[PDB]
mmCIF file of C-alpha atoms and ligand atoms in Angstrom:
data_model
loop_
_atom_site.group_PDB
_atom_site.id
_atom_site.type_symbol
_atom_site.label_atom_id
_atom_site.label_comp_id
_atom_site.label_asym_id
_atom_site.label_seq_id
_atom_site.Cartn_x
_atom_site.Cartn_y
_atom_site.Cartn_z
ATOM 1 C CA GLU P 612 -29.675 -99.171 45.153
ATOM 2 C CA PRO P 613 -29.075 -95.470 44.415
ATOM 3 C CA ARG P 614 -26.756 -93.790 46.901
ATOM 4 C CA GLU P 615 -27.781 -90.775 48.986
ATOM 5 C CA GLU P 616 -25.538 -87.745 48.508
ATOM 6 C CA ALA P 617 -24.201 -86.037 51.620
ATOM 7 C CA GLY P 618 -25.793 -82.881 52.968
ATOM 8 C CA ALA P 619 -29.233 -84.392 52.284
ATOM 9 C CA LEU P 620 -28.784 -83.346 48.638
ATOM 10 C CA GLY P 621 -31.226 -86.087 47.603
ATOM 11 C CA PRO P 622 -30.742 -89.147 45.405
ATOM 12 C CA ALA P 623 -27.851 -88.671 43.000
ATOM 13 C CA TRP P 624 -29.719 -90.712 40.369
ATOM 14 C CA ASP P 625 -32.678 -93.047 39.942
ATOM 15 C CA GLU P 626 -33.161 -96.214 37.916
ATOM 16 C CA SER P 627 -35.127 -94.367 35.211
ATOM 17 C CA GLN P 628 -31.796 -93.060 33.876
ATOM 18 C CA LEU P 629 -30.558 -96.638 33.335
ATOM 19 C CA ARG P 630 -31.217 -98.492 30.104
ATOM 20 C CA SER P 631 -33.028 -101.818 30.383
ATOM 21 C CA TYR P 632 -31.481 -105.066 29.169
ATOM 22 C CA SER P 633 -32.342 -108.755 29.033
ATOM 23 C CA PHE P 634 -29.655 -110.137 31.345
ATOM 24 C CA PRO P 635 -29.334 -110.145 35.147
ATOM 25 C CA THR P 636 -26.488 -108.654 37.159
ATOM 26 C CA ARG P 637 -24.987 -108.694 40.632
ATOM 27 C CA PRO P 638 -23.494 -105.554 42.204
ATOM 28 C CA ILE P 639 -19.780 -104.781 42.206
ATOM 29 C CA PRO P 640 -18.589 -104.181 45.797
ATOM 30 C CA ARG P 641 -18.099 -100.571 46.896
ATOM 31 C CA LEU P 642 -15.229 -100.720 49.386
ATOM 32 C CA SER P 643 -12.613 -98.517 51.003
ATOM 33 C CA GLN P 644 -8.990 -98.449 49.887
ATOM 34 C CA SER P 645 -8.120 -99.495 53.455
ATOM 35 C CA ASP P 646 -10.424 -102.536 53.324
ATOM 36 C CA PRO P 647 -8.392 -105.739 52.774
ATOM 37 C CA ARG P 648 -11.357 -107.205 50.880
ATOM 38 C CA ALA P 649 -10.736 -104.619 48.159
ATOM 39 C CA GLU P 650 -7.045 -105.546 48.257
ATOM 40 C CA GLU P 651 -7.706 -109.229 47.542
ATOM 41 C CA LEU P 652 -10.257 -108.394 44.839
ATOM 42 C CA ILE P 653 -7.545 -106.491 42.966
ATOM 43 C CA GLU P 654 -5.068 -109.294 43.687
ATOM 44 C CA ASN P 655 -7.541 -111.930 42.455
ATOM 45 C CA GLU P 656 -8.214 -109.721 39.396
ATOM 46 C CA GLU P 657 -11.859 -109.076 40.219
ATOM 47 C CA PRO P 658 -13.679 -105.755 39.831
ATOM 48 C CA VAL P 659 -14.066 -103.424 42.792
ATOM 49 C CA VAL P 660 -15.165 -99.820 43.274
ATOM 50 C CA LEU P 661 -12.861 -97.872 45.589
ATOM 51 C CA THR P 662 -14.675 -94.928 47.160
ATOM 52 C CA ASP P 663 -11.845 -93.052 48.907
ATOM 53 C CA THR P 664 -8.623 -93.208 46.879
ATOM 54 C CA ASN P 665 -8.389 -89.447 46.258
ATOM 55 C CA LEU P 666 -6.789 -90.611 43.015
ATOM 56 C CA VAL P 667 -8.018 -87.708 40.869
ATOM 57 C CA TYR P 668 -9.054 -85.495 43.788
ATOM 58 C CA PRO P 669 -7.820 -82.229 42.172
ATOM 59 C CA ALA P 670 -9.738 -83.100 38.984
ATOM 60 C CA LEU P 671 -13.110 -83.220 40.764
ATOM 61 C CA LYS P 672 -13.489 -79.472 40.134
ATOM 62 C CA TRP P 673 -13.203 -79.968 36.365
ATOM 63 C CA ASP P 674 -15.957 -78.913 33.983
ATOM 64 C CA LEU P 675 -16.235 -77.707 30.392
ATOM 65 C CA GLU P 676 -15.453 -74.132 31.453
ATOM 66 C CA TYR P 677 -12.435 -74.868 33.660
ATOM 67 C CA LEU P 678 -10.976 -77.288 31.102
ATOM 68 C CA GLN P 679 -11.480 -74.980 28.117
ATOM 69 C CA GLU P 680 -9.742 -72.211 30.069
ATOM 70 C CA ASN P 681 -6.749 -74.277 31.215
ATOM 71 C CA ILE P 682 -6.505 -77.302 28.898
ATOM 72 C CA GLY P 683 -4.618 -75.286 26.270
ATOM 73 C CA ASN P 684 -4.508 -75.277 22.488
ATOM 74 C CA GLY P 685 -4.171 -78.838 21.217
ATOM 75 C CA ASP P 686 -5.826 -81.484 19.088
ATOM 76 C CA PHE P 687 -8.447 -83.655 20.804
ATOM 77 C CA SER P 688 -9.867 -86.775 19.163
ATOM 78 C CA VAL P 689 -13.671 -86.484 19.019
ATOM 79 C CA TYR P 690 -15.933 -89.342 17.922
ATOM 80 C CA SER P 691 -19.391 -88.738 16.462
ATOM 81 C CA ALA P 692 -22.397 -91.045 16.468
ATOM 82 C CA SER P 693 -25.919 -90.696 15.087
ATOM 83 C CA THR P 694 -27.351 -92.557 18.115
ATOM 84 C CA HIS P 695 -26.408 -93.477 21.675
ATOM 85 C CA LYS P 696 -24.759 -96.713 20.497
ATOM 86 C CA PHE P 697 -21.169 -95.750 19.737
ATOM 87 C CA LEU P 698 -18.755 -98.100 17.993
ATOM 88 C CA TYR P 699 -15.032 -98.124 17.253
ATOM 89 C CA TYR P 700 -13.273 -99.035 14.000
ATOM 90 C CA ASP P 701 -9.569 -99.871 14.104
ATOM 91 C CA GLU P 702 -8.382 -97.751 11.173
ATOM 92 C CA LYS P 703 -5.483 -100.131 10.499
ATOM 93 C CA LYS P 704 -7.815 -103.139 10.146
ATOM 94 C CA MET P 705 -10.202 -101.334 7.767
ATOM 95 C CA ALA P 706 -8.185 -102.849 4.907
ATOM 96 C CA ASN P 707 -8.826 -106.469 5.915
ATOM 97 C CA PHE P 708 -12.609 -105.977 5.674
ATOM 98 C CA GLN P 709 -13.363 -103.808 2.643
ATOM 99 C CA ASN P 710 -17.148 -104.239 2.736
ATOM 100 C CA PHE P 711 -17.529 -102.565 6.132
ATOM 101 C CA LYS P 712 -18.229 -98.832 6.291
ATOM 102 C CA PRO P 713 -18.198 -96.630 9.420
ATOM 103 C CA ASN P 714 -16.658 -91.241 12.607
ATOM 104 C CA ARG P 715 -13.716 -89.447 14.232
ATOM 105 C CA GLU P 716 -12.760 -85.779 13.994
ATOM 106 C CA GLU P 717 -9.840 -83.771 15.365
ATOM 107 C CA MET P 718 -10.370 -80.312 16.819
ATOM 108 C CA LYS P 719 -9.354 -77.910 19.556
ATOM 109 C CA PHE P 720 -11.116 -78.116 22.906
ATOM 110 C CA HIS P 721 -13.223 -74.984 22.425
ATOM 111 C CA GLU P 722 -14.530 -76.439 19.154
ATOM 112 C CA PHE P 723 -15.732 -79.529 21.027
ATOM 113 C CA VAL P 724 -17.476 -77.324 23.605
ATOM 114 C CA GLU P 725 -19.086 -75.393 20.745
ATOM 115 C CA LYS P 726 -20.371 -78.578 19.093
ATOM 116 C CA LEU P 727 -21.582 -79.974 22.426
ATOM 117 C CA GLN P 728 -23.272 -76.619 23.056
ATOM 118 C CA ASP P 729 -24.541 -76.449 19.466
ATOM 119 C CA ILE P 730 -26.142 -79.890 19.774
ATOM 120 C CA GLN P 731 -27.425 -78.852 23.213
ATOM 121 C CA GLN P 732 -29.652 -76.414 21.362
ATOM 122 C CA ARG P 733 -31.924 -77.940 18.691
ATOM 123 C CA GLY P 734 -32.278 -81.162 20.711
ATOM 124 C CA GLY P 735 -30.151 -82.793 18.043
ATOM 125 C CA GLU P 736 -30.112 -86.587 18.118
ATOM 126 C CA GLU P 737 -26.354 -86.531 17.451
ATOM 127 C CA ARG P 738 -23.944 -87.420 20.251
ATOM 128 C CA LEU P 739 -20.206 -86.876 20.666
ATOM 129 C CA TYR P 740 -17.482 -88.399 22.831
ATOM 130 C CA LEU P 741 -14.091 -86.781 23.456
ATOM 131 C CA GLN P 742 -11.273 -89.263 24.087
ATOM 132 C CA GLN P 743 -7.694 -87.993 24.161
ATOM 133 C CA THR P 744 -4.549 -89.175 25.912
ATOM 134 C CA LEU P 745 -2.982 -86.585 28.198
ATOM 135 C CA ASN P 746 0.216 -85.106 26.772
ATOM 136 C CA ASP P 747 2.569 -82.157 27.247
ATOM 137 C CA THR P 748 0.385 -79.603 25.423
ATOM 138 C CA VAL P 749 -1.855 -79.202 28.493
ATOM 139 C CA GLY P 750 -1.969 -75.879 30.305
ATOM 140 C CA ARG P 751 -0.290 -74.987 33.571
ATOM 141 C CA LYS P 752 -3.265 -75.501 35.888
ATOM 142 C CA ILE P 753 -4.020 -78.920 34.370
ATOM 143 C CA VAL P 754 -0.455 -80.106 34.999
ATOM 144 C CA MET P 755 -0.798 -78.974 38.615
ATOM 145 C CA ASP P 756 -4.013 -80.985 38.934
ATOM 146 C CA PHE P 757 -2.331 -83.929 37.210
ATOM 147 C CA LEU P 758 0.541 -83.777 39.690
ATOM 148 C CA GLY P 759 -2.036 -83.586 42.487
ATOM 149 C CA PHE P 760 -3.269 -87.097 41.734
ATOM 150 C CA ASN P 761 -2.656 -89.775 44.368
ATOM 151 C CA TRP P 762 0.387 -91.255 42.675
ATOM 152 C CA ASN P 763 1.511 -92.683 46.024
ATOM 153 C CA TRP P 764 -1.445 -95.074 46.146
ATOM 154 C CA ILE P 765 -1.649 -96.147 42.503
ATOM 155 C CA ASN P 766 2.120 -96.589 42.201
ATOM 156 C CA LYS P 767 1.988 -98.816 45.281
ATOM 157 C CA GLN P 768 -0.761 -100.785 43.529
ATOM 158 C CA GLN P 769 1.432 -101.091 40.428
ATOM 159 C CA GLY P 770 4.244 -102.679 42.429
ATOM 160 C CA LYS P 771 1.969 -104.787 44.629
ATOM 161 C CA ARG P 772 0.559 -106.475 41.501
ATOM 162 C CA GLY P 773 3.788 -106.498 39.483
ATOM 163 C CA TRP P 774 2.012 -104.698 36.651
ATOM 164 C CA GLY P 775 3.914 -103.160 33.769
ATOM 165 C CA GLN P 776 4.353 -99.487 33.005
ATOM 166 C CA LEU P 777 1.528 -96.960 33.006
ATOM 167 C CA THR P 778 0.860 -97.027 29.269
ATOM 168 C CA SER P 779 -1.361 -93.941 29.075
ATOM 169 C CA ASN P 780 -3.831 -91.663 30.817
ATOM 170 C CA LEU P 781 -7.032 -91.254 28.808
ATOM 171 C CA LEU P 782 -9.432 -88.338 29.292
ATOM 172 C CA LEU P 783 -13.030 -89.254 28.427
ATOM 173 C CA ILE P 784 -15.753 -86.612 28.185
ATOM 174 C CA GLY P 785 -19.151 -87.828 27.021
ATOM 175 C CA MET P 786 -22.723 -86.669 26.614
ATOM 176 C CA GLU P 787 -25.704 -87.973 28.552
ATOM 177 C CA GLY P 788 -26.953 -91.230 27.071
ATOM 178 C CA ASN P 789 -23.640 -92.139 25.434
ATOM 179 C CA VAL P 790 -23.137 -95.915 25.341
ATOM 180 C CA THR P 791 -19.772 -97.640 25.021
ATOM 181 C CA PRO P 792 -20.681 -101.152 23.796
ATOM 182 C CA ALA P 793 -19.508 -104.295 25.543
ATOM 183 C CA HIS P 794 -15.817 -104.907 24.851
ATOM 184 C CA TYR P 795 -12.698 -106.130 26.627
ATOM 185 C CA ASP P 796 -9.273 -104.513 26.894
ATOM 186 C CA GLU P 797 -5.922 -106.252 27.262
ATOM 187 C CA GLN P 798 -4.497 -103.990 29.995
ATOM 188 C CA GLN P 799 -5.260 -103.350 33.651
ATOM 189 C CA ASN P 800 -7.418 -100.261 34.134
ATOM 190 C CA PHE P 801 -8.241 -97.988 37.050
ATOM 191 C CA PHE P 802 -11.418 -96.176 36.006
ATOM 192 C CA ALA P 803 -11.424 -92.820 37.822
ATOM 193 C CA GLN P 804 -14.777 -91.030 37.634
ATOM 194 C CA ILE P 805 -14.701 -87.235 37.941
ATOM 195 C CA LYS P 806 -17.910 -85.590 36.694
ATOM 196 C CA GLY P 807 -21.334 -87.120 36.167
ATOM 197 C CA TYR P 808 -22.354 -90.738 36.640
ATOM 198 C CA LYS P 809 -21.596 -93.810 34.531
ATOM 199 C CA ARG P 810 -23.264 -97.215 34.725
ATOM 200 C CA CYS P 811 -20.634 -99.932 34.255
ATOM 201 C CA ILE P 812 -21.674 -103.502 33.435
ATOM 202 C CA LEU P 813 -18.781 -105.971 33.538
ATOM 203 C CA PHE P 814 -18.626 -109.598 32.448
ATOM 204 C CA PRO P 815 -15.839 -112.028 33.439
ATOM 205 C CA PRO P 816 -13.492 -113.479 30.802
ATOM 206 C CA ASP P 817 -15.106 -116.917 31.161
ATOM 207 C CA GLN P 818 -18.253 -115.536 29.491
ATOM 208 C CA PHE P 819 -16.442 -115.266 26.139
ATOM 209 C CA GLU P 820 -18.885 -117.837 24.732
ATOM 210 C CA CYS P 821 -21.850 -115.556 25.526
ATOM 211 C CA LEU P 822 -20.646 -112.234 24.062
ATOM 212 C CA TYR P 823 -19.352 -113.254 20.611
ATOM 213 C CA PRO P 824 -16.535 -110.786 19.852
ATOM 214 C CA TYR P 825 -15.827 -109.880 16.253
ATOM 215 C CA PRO P 826 -12.956 -111.657 14.484
ATOM 216 C CA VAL P 827 -9.582 -110.418 15.512
ATOM 217 C CA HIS P 828 -8.888 -109.005 12.058
ATOM 218 C CA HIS P 829 -12.238 -107.248 11.998
ATOM 219 C CA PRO P 830 -12.075 -103.475 12.667
ATOM 220 C CA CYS P 831 -14.350 -103.997 15.702
ATOM 221 C CA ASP P 832 -11.889 -106.453 17.277
ATOM 222 C CA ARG P 833 -12.544 -107.007 21.003
ATOM 223 C CA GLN P 834 -16.121 -105.630 20.777
ATOM 224 C CA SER P 835 -19.233 -107.760 21.173
ATOM 225 C CA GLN P 836 -21.354 -108.520 18.116
ATOM 226 C CA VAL P 837 -24.514 -108.678 20.248
ATOM 227 C CA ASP P 838 -26.841 -105.681 20.098
ATOM 228 C CA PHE P 839 -27.727 -105.364 23.783
ATOM 229 C CA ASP P 840 -30.773 -103.303 22.762
ATOM 230 C CA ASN P 841 -32.057 -106.085 20.464
ATOM 231 C CA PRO P 842 -30.104 -109.341 20.885
ATOM 232 C CA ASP P 843 -30.243 -111.766 17.951
ATOM 233 C CA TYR P 844 -30.668 -114.937 19.987
ATOM 234 C CA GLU P 845 -30.613 -117.000 16.782
ATOM 235 C CA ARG P 846 -27.019 -116.026 15.958
ATOM 236 C CA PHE P 847 -25.950 -115.475 19.591
ATOM 237 C CA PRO P 848 -27.817 -118.113 21.629
ATOM 238 C CA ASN P 849 -25.466 -118.152 24.630
ATOM 239 C CA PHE P 850 -26.178 -114.454 25.247
ATOM 240 C CA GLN P 851 -29.249 -115.760 27.106
ATOM 241 C CA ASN P 852 -26.818 -117.128 29.728
ATOM 242 C CA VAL P 853 -24.871 -113.895 30.248
ATOM 243 C CA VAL P 854 -24.612 -112.508 33.790
ATOM 244 C CA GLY P 855 -22.883 -109.196 34.456
ATOM 245 C CA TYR P 856 -21.389 -107.314 37.380
ATOM 246 C CA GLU P 857 -23.006 -103.895 37.693
ATOM 247 C CA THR P 858 -22.346 -100.583 39.423
ATOM 248 C CA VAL P 859 -22.804 -96.839 38.986
ATOM 249 C CA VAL P 860 -19.658 -94.782 39.620
ATOM 250 C CA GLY P 861 -19.799 -91.110 40.521
ATOM 251 C CA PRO P 862 -17.340 -88.333 41.334
ATOM 252 C CA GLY P 863 -14.533 -89.673 43.510
ATOM 253 C CA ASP P 864 -15.138 -93.357 42.759
ATOM 254 C CA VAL P 865 -12.471 -95.538 41.146
ATOM 255 C CA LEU P 866 -13.541 -98.760 39.417
ATOM 256 C CA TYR P 867 -10.909 -101.442 38.871
ATOM 257 C CA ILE P 868 -11.564 -103.101 35.509
ATOM 258 C CA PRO P 869 -9.209 -106.114 35.358
ATOM 259 C CA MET P 870 -7.633 -106.933 32.013
ATOM 260 C CA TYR P 871 -9.781 -109.008 29.613
ATOM 261 C CA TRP P 872 -12.959 -108.253 31.590
ATOM 262 C CA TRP P 873 -15.774 -107.075 29.355
ATOM 263 C CA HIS P 874 -17.258 -103.692 30.204
ATOM 264 C CA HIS P 875 -20.370 -101.907 28.941
ATOM 265 C CA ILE P 876 -20.229 -98.225 29.936
ATOM 266 C CA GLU P 877 -23.118 -95.782 29.594
ATOM 267 C CA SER P 878 -23.501 -92.200 30.781
ATOM 268 C CA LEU P 879 -26.811 -91.880 32.604
ATOM 269 C CA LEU P 880 -29.691 -90.386 30.645
ATOM 270 C CA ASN P 881 -30.507 -86.769 31.520
ATOM 271 C CA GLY P 882 -27.430 -86.797 33.776
ATOM 272 C CA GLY P 883 -25.420 -84.110 32.002
ATOM 273 C CA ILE P 884 -21.890 -84.586 30.768
ATOM 274 C CA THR P 885 -19.576 -87.224 32.205
ATOM 275 C CA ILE P 886 -15.824 -86.942 32.758
ATOM 276 C CA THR P 887 -13.488 -89.877 33.390
ATOM 277 C CA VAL P 888 -9.738 -90.483 33.505
ATOM 278 C CA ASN P 889 -8.387 -93.986 32.890
ATOM 279 C CA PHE P 890 -5.053 -95.346 34.121
ATOM 280 C CA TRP P 891 -3.787 -98.074 31.780
ATOM 281 C CA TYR P 892 -1.187 -100.582 32.994
ATOM 282 C CA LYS P 893 0.330 -103.507 31.135
ATOM 283 C CA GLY P 894 -0.582 -106.665 33.010
ATOM 284 C CA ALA P 895 1.826 -108.617 35.145
ATOM 285 C CA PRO P 896 4.171 -110.756 33.014
ATOM 286 C CA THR P 897 3.219 -114.370 32.444
ATOM 287 C CA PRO P 898 4.765 -116.610 35.147
ATOM 288 C CA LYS P 899 7.528 -119.065 34.313
ATOM 289 C CA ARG P 900 5.720 -122.071 35.848
ATOM 290 C CA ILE P 901 2.301 -122.133 34.178
ATOM 291 C CA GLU P 902 -0.379 -123.506 36.505
ATOM 292 C CA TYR P 903 -3.050 -125.614 34.801
ATOM 293 C CA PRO P 904 -5.875 -125.433 34.031
ATOM 294 C CA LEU P 905 -5.314 -121.995 32.531
ATOM 295 C CA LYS P 906 -7.235 -118.896 33.535
ATOM 296 C CA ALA P 907 -10.112 -117.870 31.289
ATOM 297 C CA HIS P 908 -8.244 -114.792 30.050
ATOM 298 C CA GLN P 909 -5.268 -116.991 29.147
ATOM 299 C CA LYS P 910 -7.502 -119.053 26.856
ATOM 300 C CA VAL P 911 -8.776 -115.802 25.337
ATOM 301 C CA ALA P 912 -5.139 -114.871 24.727
ATOM 302 C CA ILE P 913 -4.556 -118.250 23.064
ATOM 303 C CA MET P 914 -7.615 -117.855 20.837
ATOM 304 C CA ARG P 915 -6.452 -114.382 19.793
ATOM 305 C CA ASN P 916 -3.000 -115.711 18.875
ATOM 306 C CA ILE P 917 -4.398 -118.551 16.747
ATOM 307 C CA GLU P 918 -6.483 -116.124 14.692
ATOM 308 C CA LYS P 919 -3.549 -113.719 14.333
ATOM 309 C CA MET P 920 -1.214 -116.490 13.167
ATOM 310 C CA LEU P 921 -3.664 -117.974 10.659
ATOM 311 C CA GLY P 922 -3.966 -114.480 9.199
ATOM 312 C CA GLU P 923 -0.224 -114.364 8.526
ATOM 313 C CA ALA P 924 0.157 -118.040 7.606
ATOM 314 C CA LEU P 925 -2.642 -117.911 5.026
ATOM 315 C CA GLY P 926 -1.601 -114.438 3.873
ATOM 316 C CA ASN P 927 -5.197 -113.231 4.086
ATOM 317 C CA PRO P 928 -7.493 -112.573 7.083
ATOM 318 C CA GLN P 929 -10.506 -113.543 4.957
ATOM 319 C CA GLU P 930 -9.325 -117.183 4.842
ATOM 320 C CA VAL P 931 -9.181 -117.594 8.639
ATOM 321 C CA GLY P 932 -12.888 -118.363 8.901
ATOM 322 C CA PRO P 933 -13.099 -120.993 6.158
ATOM 323 C CA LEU P 934 -10.045 -122.863 7.457
ATOM 324 C CA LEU P 935 -11.345 -122.914 11.044
ATOM 325 C CA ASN P 936 -14.717 -124.313 9.961
ATOM 326 C CA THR P 937 -13.001 -126.955 7.819
ATOM 327 C CA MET P 938 -11.061 -127.915 10.952
ATOM 328 C CA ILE P 939 -13.978 -128.418 13.375
ATOM 329 C CA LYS P 940 -16.901 -129.347 11.100
ATOM 330 C CA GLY P 941 -17.637 -133.010 11.771
ATOM 331 C CA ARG P 942 -14.375 -133.428 13.695
ATOM 332 C CA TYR P 943 -14.721 -131.431 16.935
ATOM 333 C CA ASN P 944 -18.480 -130.740 16.914
HETATM 334 O O1 A0W M 1240 -16.481 -95.215 28.125
HETATM 335 C C1 A0W M 1240 -15.728 -95.559 29.078
HETATM 336 O O2 A0W M 1240 -15.854 -95.005 30.212
HETATM 337 C C2 A0W M 1240 -14.654 -96.640 28.852
HETATM 338 N N1 A0W M 1240 -14.450 -96.774 27.429
HETATM 339 C C3 A0W M 1240 -13.513 -97.714 26.886
HETATM 340 O O3 A0W M 1240 -12.855 -98.439 27.601
HETATM 341 C C4 A0W M 1240 -13.392 -97.769 25.354
HETATM 342 C C5 A0W M 1240 -12.573 -98.792 24.655
HETATM 343 O O4 A0W M 1240 -11.865 -99.745 25.392
HETATM 344 N N2 A0W M 1240 -12.535 -98.768 23.227
HETATM 345 C C6 A0W M 1240 -11.765 -99.717 22.409
HETATM 346 C C7 A0W M 1240 -10.434 -99.901 23.103
HETATM 347 C C8 A0W M 1240 -9.513 -100.727 22.212
HETATM 348 C C9 A0W M 1240 -10.141 -102.034 21.782
HETATM 349 C C10 A0W M 1240 -11.560 -101.884 21.246
HETATM 350 C C11 A0W M 1240 -12.434 -101.040 22.159
HETATM 351 C C12 A0W M 1240 -13.289 -97.756 22.484
HETATM 352 O O5 A0W M 1240 -13.243 -97.753 21.279
HETATM 353 N N3 A0W M 1240 -14.098 -96.751 23.177
HETATM 354 C C13 A0W M 1240 -14.837 -95.770 22.412
HETATM 355 C C14 A0W M 1240 -15.895 -96.617 21.745
HETATM 356 C C15 A0W M 1240 -16.754 -95.816 20.788
HETATM 357 C C16 A0W M 1240 -15.925 -95.048 19.793
HETATM 358 C C17 A0W M 1240 -14.873 -94.202 20.469
HETATM 359 C C18 A0W M 1240 -14.008 -95.018 21.407
HETATM 360 C C19 A0W M 1240 -14.150 -96.762 24.593
HETATM 361 O O6 A0W M 1240 -14.813 -95.942 25.183
HETATM 362 ZN ZN1 ZN M 1241 -12.375 -100.415 27.432
#
């Protein structure tokens, strides 16, 4: 259901810019910050798109030119990929899995604009994705925009939910067609879209069985093993039962991605560059009186801890698998 831009500017996007996948989805609600329904969705840790937060209102004028002029001289982490399917490799965990081979490159902002402009010409199949946490090295005008964010609203949300401290603000600038594969994060996230359009497909924590994350010690920890473009239903049979929550966010929209919810993010094809700012918050602390049965994301937390501990106990991540199979084979299956 593509939205109609004001001023009769025509459809902002059409379904031809969306990639096709095998699973069905239901839409994420697009609500107003003043709507109590959006307030309970955040309280019940369910996704919602807020359309009128003014959270990054001063940033809605950002583009490659404005940023290059005022972002300043600093190092920005840039990730390269030979195709649309990006993928992340925890550098620290590269040691555990020696066989795997991957990617990232540091550079000043103008260098990124040159590469993005260089690849613009030639129709190069390569794609890039800038992802850098905001720090003090940003120029004057960018700090003014940063201060112009709606801190009143988001800070009130932080207290209302008892969340932890704002861990970081992440600036994401991507090329059209970029795909962030399905993965889950362990912190609460307000996904503030600025430039371009991004299709966000979320899956609840209870669909862990359908998305098959890599081992915790694997560099791709928290990412799905399933190739959405070509699912291996033999290895990943329960992916045929996956059902996602879908939406397309545009400038001014804020998507709440609750902690441990999977998200598959893609910048629309032929939609130009996309710009996003994320607000990361440590989740609310675990209550003192645990209510059973546990939430799905609590069981995911338990599973993560077991794998982590067996890695230390056995003194080798590679032994975690064999010992877990020995434990269940013919005893719990
Ligand atoms: O694209 C968006 O709008 C939202 N993107 C994200 O939340 C990303 C993300 O959470 N992650 C990792 C976070 C830590 C745990 C493993 C996944 C990414 O690597 N990436 C990219 C993945 C490809 C390689 C560079 C980093 C994310 O985008
Ligand atoms: Zn994420």
